[PDB]
C-alpha cells in the first residue's frame, strides 16, 4: 500500500474506535439439601 | 386446524387465487392506489418476517408496538400517511 | 463560509444510508405538471397519452401510489445521481463500470421491485423526450450530500448548496470533513477530447444528451469538467457530437411552413454550470469503492466550490 | 467521546444449573450461554432564536451618548437569558 | 328492489379506542450513555 | 457590514395607511441610486414615468434591469428600513413575503416580473399623493412560459378579423372573466407590437437571401441546407438583441428554508439567500 | 367492461347508495380523493 500526500493533506486526522462497555457474568446458589424443609421426611444415613 | 371436521367454512374467499384472496390480499396490488383503508388486508395477506427459522415464540417480539394502520385526523379512515409516527396496540392482528 | 440546505422527502428514489457523503443529489418537479405541459407541447400527429401511460404505470408500482396527485404535501423529492445513471446504463460508452454500478444499485436498495422501478424510470424518461417535454427542464441540482437522518420510509437530508466543499464539518466515522465523488460511468471531461489539456481553473457542467429518433429515444447525462466557459462550452460539445446532431436535425403564394426542423426536433443536449475548481491543476483518482457489499469505481474530486444560478443552456 | 464511537458492545455469559437423575434419561451435562448485545444511537434537539436588532445590540458597538439603547440592551439580555434557561431545562425534560 | 340474490356477506370493520396503559419497569433495566452538548447556528426568518 | 437604507416616513400618514404598511414586511422595492437616506418619492410609482403616463410592461421590464432592488426589512411606526440585495451580504434573516399567484418550493431561484395579472399589489397612499407597486416574485422555471402565454393571448386577440399554467401540482387560470379586457390589453401593446415586428422582419429577411431555401423542397433542401438590404440585417439584430436581453431577467434570490415549511403559499414569509 | 356507458352507469349508480365515492369528473392522474364534507358529528367513520 503506497499513498503519496502533498503538503499537510487531510485524512491524516482520522480517529474512530469501538468499545467493549462491559462483561456481565452470573453466579449460582448452592442448594444444601439437609437445610431444606423436605428433609424432615427422611433419615439420611451413610453406608459405604 | 380450527374446526378439524371441515376444510373451510367459505370456499369463495379462503383458497388461493379465489375471489376474496384476489380482492383483498395485498400481494396483487389491485386495491393499491386506493386511499381508503381496508381491514381485510391483515387477514387475507400472508405475513412474512425473516425470523421464520429463528424463533420459538417471537410472539413477544412481534406483539409489542406495531405502528398505526389507519389515519388519525381525517373524517374517513384513510390509509396512514407516510409522514406519520403514531403507534398503537393491535391485539387481534396477532391471532388473526 | 458555505451554505447548507434541508429537505424532507421519501426514500423511494434515494437512500442516504447507501449514498456516501459527497454524492450529488438531484431534485424533481411535481409530475403533475407534465400532463398539461405535454398537452400543449406535443407534436402534431402524435398522442401524448403514451407519456401518461409511462408516468401512471411508473407511479403505480414505486411506493404508496396514492397522494401523488394534487394534495401531495409529502412527495418523492430527491433522487441520487447514481440512480439516474444506473437506470440508463445501456448508453454509457465505458460499459463495464456502468454495468457494475447498475448491478450494485439493484442489489443495495430494497431488493424487491427495483428492477421494476428502474425500467419504469427508464421508460418514463424515454416517453418524455418522445413527447417533447425534456428532462432537463424538470431535474435540477440540489447539492452534495452532507448528513442525513432516516426513519421508516422517509428521510431528512442536509446538503451543501454553495461554497467550498471541504469547509463543511460533519459527524462522520473517519474525519470531520468529506469530499465530493461521482460514479465513474458518468465522468466525461470535455478538455482531453478537444486536447487543450491545460492546468488551472475548470468548471463542472451537468449535461444531458438527447437522441430522438422515432421509437428509439435516448437520454443520458454526464458530469463535464472542462476549461471552457459557459459560452463556448456549447460549441465544444456540439462539435464532438456531430452524428447525433445530424441524425436529430434530419429525422426529428402559400407559405406551408409544415414539417420543417423546429427547435425541439433539433435539440440534442442541454447543460448547466454548477461549480468550479480554482486550484493549481485538478487531480482526481479513480479508485474502486464499496457500496455495502459490491464494488464500483468512482471519481474522487478535490476542491470543488459549488456554484449557482441554475439556468439551462440549450444546444440545437 | 461518544461522538467518536463507531459501535459499542456488551457481553453476557450465564451458566445454568442441572439435576442428577436416574434412568431412563440421557445423562445430563451443564450448559453454558454466550450472548452479545449492541447499543443504539439517539440524540436530542432544542432551538431558540435571537432576532436582528437584538444581535445589533448584544454586539459591543460603540458606547452611545444615550441611555435608551442601554435599556434596550438590558431588555434583550434578559430575554435571551430566559430563552436559554428554558432551552437548557428542555434537555432535563427530554431525558425522562 | 329488495331481492336476495342467494348469497350473503360477512362484514369486517375495525374501530379504534383510546386507553391508558400501565407501564412497569425494573431497576437498572437500561444502560444509558450521555455524550456532550454541541451547538449549531443557522439563519432563519428575521432571526439567527 | 450589510448595506442599509433608511426611508423616513413623514407625518400626516393616516393610521389606516400605516396599518397596511405594517403588512409590507418582506416586499421588494427598487431605487434608481443606492444611498442611505431615501425619500418616499423615490420608490413611488411616480418615479418611473418613462414617457409621461405610467410605465408599460416593456417599460417596467426595462426598468427592473437598470434599478437596484432592495428588500423591505422590519418597519417601525416612525420610519422604514430596507436592505439592498445584490451586494453587501445581509447578515440578518432576509425573509421574503412571496407575492405571486403560484407557490414557491424549497430551492427555487426567484426573478421579477411586472404585474401582468390581476394587479392588486398597489398600496394607495392618498394622504401623500403617491403609490407603490411591488414586483411579482416568480420562480425561474415559469419565467419563459408566463411571458409567452400572456403575449400569445393578446396576439390572438388582435387576430379578430383551457389556457392554464401549472406548477407544483397547482393550476392558475389565465382567462380573466370579463370579455371587456381593456386596460391590461393597453399596458401590453407595445410589447406585442415590438415583438411581432421583429419576427416578421426576420422571416421576410431569411427568405430574401438564398434562392434555394423552400423552392428546392421544404424538406429536402431546407434540412440539407441546415446540415440597401445591408442596412436591414443591422436593423434586425440591433433590435432583436435589445429585446432578448430585456427578457433575460437573471435570478436574484433563492428560497432556502432550514427546518420550516417546505412550500410557500402566496402571502407567507420565508427565508431567502442571495445569489 | 367492453362498453364505457356501462362502467359509467355502474359508478353513477353506486354513487347513490353511500357517501364514500369519487367526485363526479374523474381525475386524469392522481388518487381520486373524495369531496370533503363540512360536518363531523360522532367520530371517524369506520369503513365496513
From TrEMBL, chain C:
Entry keyword set: Capsid protein, Host nucleus, Virion
GO biological process: viral capsid assembly
Cellular component aspect of the GO annotation: viral capsid
GO terms assigned for molecular function: DNA binding
Residues passing through the membrane, by range: none
Protein name: Capsid protein
Organism for this UniProt entry: Human herpesvirus 3 (HHV-3)
UniProtKB/TrEMBL annotation, chain E:
Protein name: Major capsid protein
Segment of the intact protein contained: 1061 to 1108 of 1396
From TrEMBL, chain F:
GO cellular component entries: viral capsid
InterPro entries: Herpes_capsid_2 (IPR002690)
Pfam families xrefs: Herpes_V23
Keyword annotations from UniProtKB, A to Z: Capsid protein, Host nucleus, Virion
Keyword Isomerase among UniProt keywords: no
Domain of life: Viruses
UniProt entry tagged with the keyword Ion transport: no
GO terms of molecular function: structural molecule activity
Coiled coil: none
Protein name per UniProt: Capsid protein
Upper lineage: Viruses, Duplodnaviria, Heunggongvirae, Peploviricota, Herviviricetes
GN (gene name): ORF41
Amino acid at each position: 500500500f503506497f499513498k503519496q500526500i502533498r503538503s499537510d493533506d487531510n485524512s491524516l486526522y482520522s480517529a474512530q474506535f469501538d468499545i467493549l462497555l462491559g462483561t456481565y457474568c452470573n453466579t449460582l446458589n448452592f442448594v444444601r439439601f439437609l437445610e431444606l424443609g423436605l428433609s424432615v421426611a427422611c433419615i439420611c444415613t451413610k453406608f459405604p | 386446524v380450527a374446526y378439524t371436521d371441515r376444510a373451510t367454512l367459505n370456499p369463495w374467499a379462503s383458497q388461493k387465487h379465489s375471489y376474496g384472496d384476489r380482492l383483498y390480499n395485498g400481494t396483487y396490488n389491485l386495491t393499491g392506489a386506493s386511499p381508503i383503508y381496508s381491514p381485510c388486508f391483515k387477514f387475507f395477506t400472508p405475513a412474512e418476517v425473516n425470523t421464520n427459522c429463528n424463533t420459538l415464540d417471537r410472539l413477544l417480539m412481534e406483539a409489542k408496538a406495531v405502528a398505526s394502520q389507519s389515519s388519525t385526523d381525517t373524517e374517513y379512515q384513510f390509509k396512514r400517511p407516510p409522514g406519520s409516527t403514531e403507534m398503537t396496540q393491535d391485539p387481534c392482528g396477532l391471532f388473526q | 463560509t458555505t451554505q447548507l440546505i434541508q429537505q424532507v422527502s421519501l426514500t423511494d428514489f434515494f437512500r442516504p444510508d447507501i449514498e456516501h457523503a459527497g454524492s450529488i443529489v438531484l431534485i424533481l418537479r411535481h409530475p403533475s405538471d407534465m400532463i398539461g405541459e405535454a398537452n400543449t407541447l406535443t407534436q402534431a400527429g402524435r398522442d401524448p397519452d403514451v407519456l401518461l401511460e409511462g408516468l401512471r404505470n411508473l407511479f403505480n408500482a414505486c411506493t404508496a401510489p396514492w397522494t401523488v396527485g394534487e394534495g401531495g404535501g409529502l412527495r418523492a423529492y430527491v433522487t441520487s445521481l447514481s440512480f439516474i445513471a444506473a437506470c440508463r446504463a445501456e448508453e454509457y460508452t465505458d460499459k463495464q463500470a456502468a454495468d457494475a454500478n447498475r448491478t450494485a444499485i439493484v442489489s443495495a436498495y430494497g431488493c424487491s421491485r427495483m428492477e421494476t422501478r428502474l425500467i419504469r424510470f427508464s421508460e418514463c424518461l424515454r416517453a418524455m423526450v418522445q413527447c417533447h417535454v425534456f428532462p432537463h427542464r424538470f431535474i435540477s441540482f440540489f447539492g452534495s450530500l452532507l448528513e442525513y437522518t432516516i426513519q421508516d420510509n422517509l428521510c431528512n437530508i442536509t446538503a451543501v448548496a454553495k461554497g467550498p466543499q471541504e469547509a463543511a464539518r460533519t459527524d462522520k466515522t473517519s474525519t470531520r470533513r468529506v469530499t465530493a465523488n461521482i460514479p465513474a460511468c458518468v465522468f466525461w471531461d470535455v478538455d482531453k477530447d478537444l486536447h487543450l489539456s491545460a492546468d488551472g481553473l475548470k468548471h463542472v457542467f451537468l449535461v444531458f444528451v438527447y437522441t430522438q429518433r422515432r421509437q428509439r429515444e435516448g437520454v443520458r447525462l454526464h458530469l463535464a469538467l472542462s476549461q471552457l466557459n459557459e459560452q463556448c462550452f456549447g460549441r465544444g460539445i456540439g462539435f464532438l457530437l456531430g452524428r447525433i446532431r445530424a441524425e436529430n436535425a434530419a429525422w426529428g403564394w402559400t407559405g406551408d411552413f409544415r414539417g420543417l426542423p423546429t427547435q425541439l426536433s433539433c435539440m440534442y443536449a442541454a447543460y448547466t454550470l454548477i461549480g468550479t475548481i480554482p486550484s493549481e491543476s485538478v487531480r482526481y483518482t479513480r479508485r474502486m469503492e464499496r457500496f455495502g457489499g459490491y464494488n464500483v469505481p468512482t471519481i474522487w474530486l478535490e476542491g470543488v466550490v459549488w456554484g449557482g444560478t441554475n439556468t439551462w443552456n440549450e444546444c440545437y | 467521546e461518544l461522538a467518536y464511537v463507531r459501535d459499542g458492545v456488551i457481553q453476557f455469559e450465564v451458566q445454568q444449573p442441572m439435576i442428577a437423575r436416574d434412568g431412563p434419561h440421557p445423562v445430563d451435562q451443564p450448559v453454558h450461554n454466550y450472548m452479545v448485545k449492541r447499543i443504539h444511537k439517539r440524540s436530542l434537539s432544542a432551538a431558540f432564536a435571537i432576532a436582528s436588532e437584538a444581535l445589533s445590540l448584544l454586539s459591543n458597538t460603540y458606547v452611545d451618548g444615550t441611555e435608551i439603547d442601554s435599556s434596550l440592551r438590558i431588555r434583550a439580555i434578559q430575554q435571551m437569558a430566559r430563552n436559554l434557561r428554558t432551552v437548557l431545562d428542555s434537555f432535563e425534560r427530554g431525558t425522562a | 328492489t329488495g331481492f336476495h340474490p342467494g348469497i350473503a356477506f360477512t362484514v369486517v370493520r375495525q374501530d379504534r379506542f383510546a386507553t391508558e396503559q400501565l407501564l412497569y419497569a425494573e431497576r437498572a433495566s437500561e444502560s444509558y450513555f450521555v455524550g456532550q452538548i454541541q451547538v449549531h447556528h443557522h439563519d432563519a426568518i428575521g432571526g439567527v | 457590514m450589510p448595506f442599509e437604507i433608511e426611508v423616513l416616513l413623514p407625518g400626516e400618514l393616516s393610521p389606516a395607511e400605516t396599518s397596511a404598511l405594517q403588512k409590507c414586511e418582506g416586499k421588494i422595492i427598487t431605487f434608481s441610486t443606492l444611498r442611505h437616506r431615501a425619500s418616499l418619492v423615490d420608490i413611488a410609482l411616480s418615479s418611473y414615468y418613462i414617457n409621461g403616463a405610467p410605465p408599460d410592461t416593456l417599460s417596467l421590464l426595462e426598468a427592473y434591469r437598470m434599478r437596484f432592488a432592495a428588500v423591505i426589512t422590519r418597519v417601525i411606526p416612525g420610519k422604514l428600513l430596507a436592505h439592498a440585495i445584490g451586494v453587501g451580504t445581509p447578515t440578518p434573516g432576509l425573509f421574503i413575503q412571496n407575492t405571486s399567484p403560484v407557490d414557491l418550493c424549497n430551492g427555487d431561484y426567484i426573478c421579477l416580473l411586472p404585474p401582468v395579472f390581476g394587479s392588486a399589489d398597489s398600496i394607495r397612499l392618498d394622504s401623500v399623493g403617491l403609490e407603490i407597486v411591488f414586483p411579482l416574485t416568480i420562480p425561474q422555471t415559469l419565467m419563459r412560459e408566463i411571458i409567452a402565454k400572456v403575449v400569445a393571448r393578446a396576439v390572438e386577440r388582435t387576430a379578430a378579423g383551457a389556457d392554464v399554467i401549472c406548477y407544483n401540482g397547482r393550476r392558475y387560470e389565465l382567462e380573466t372573466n370579463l370579455q371587456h379586457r381593456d386596460g391590461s390589453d393597453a399596458a401590453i401593446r407595445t410589447l406585442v407590437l415590438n415583438l411581432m415586428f421583429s419576427i416578421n422582419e426576420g422571416c421576410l429577411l431569411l427568405l430574401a437571401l438564398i434562392p434555394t431555401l423552400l423552392v428546392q423542397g421544404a424538406h429536402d433542401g431546407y434540412v440539407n441546407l441546415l446540415i440597401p438590404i445591408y442596412e436591414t440585417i443591422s436593423s434586425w439584430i440591433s433590435t432583436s438583441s435589445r429585446l432578448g436581453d430585456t427578457l433575460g431577467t437573471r435570478a436574484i434570490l433563492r428560497v432556502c428554508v432550514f427546518d420550516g415549511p417546505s412550500t410557500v403559499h402566496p402571502g407567507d414569509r420565508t427565508a431567502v439567500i442571495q445569489v | 367492461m367492453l362498453h364505457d356507458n356501462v362502467t359509467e352507469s355502474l359508478r353513477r349508480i353506486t354513487a347513490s347508495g353511500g357517501r364514500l365515492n369519487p367526485t363526479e369528473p374523474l381525475p386524469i392522474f392522481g388518487g381520486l380523493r373524495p369531496a370533503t364534507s363540512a360536518g363531523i358529528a360522532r367520530g371517524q367513520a369506520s369503513v365496513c
